[PDB]
Amino acid sequence: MKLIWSEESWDDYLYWQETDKRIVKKINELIKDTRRTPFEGKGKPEPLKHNLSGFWSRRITEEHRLVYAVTDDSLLIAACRYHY
Ligand SMILES: [Mg+2]
């Protein structure tokens, strides 16, 4: 499964690398778990609605969530800072 970062989500991730290493580790942990079970597991995975229909969200922290989408061959990260 290829990992795809939107330009904004990669910037989010870089922000964390230069702000909080434990948040980076949690993001990594969530991505690895998602590779295992796409729609369940760590971070209490929940499907998003309305304008974000088609995406999922896992908890990094209360304020920050990993927003993503899973296709037959890829994990797309839409954002990893704030709720979206
Ligand atoms: Mg953003």
Give the DSSP per-residue string, 48-62: --GGGTT-EEEESSS
CA of 41 to the centre of ligand 1 (A): 24
Helix or strand or coil: residue 8? helix
7: left (phi over 0), alpha (psi -120 to 50) or beta: alpha
Domains of the chain, each with CATH number or no CATH: 1-84 (3.30.2310.20)
φ/ψ (deg, to 5) at 20 = -145, 105
Q: Is 57 exposed, middle or buried (0-12, 13-18, 19+ CB in 10 A)?
A: buried
Type of residue at 70: V
> How far from the centroid of its chain's Cα atoms is residue 51's Cα?
17
CA of 66 to the centre of ligand 1 (A): 11
Among this protein's residues, is 46 annotated catalytic?
Answer: yes
CA of 13 to the centre of ligand 1 (A): 11
CB 34 within 8 A of CB 70: yes
Distance CA 39, CA 55 (A): 10
Among this protein's residues, is 83 annotated catalytic?
Answer: yes
Which residue of the set 8, 18, 29, 46 is catalytic?
46
CA of 17 to the centre of ligand 1 (A): 16
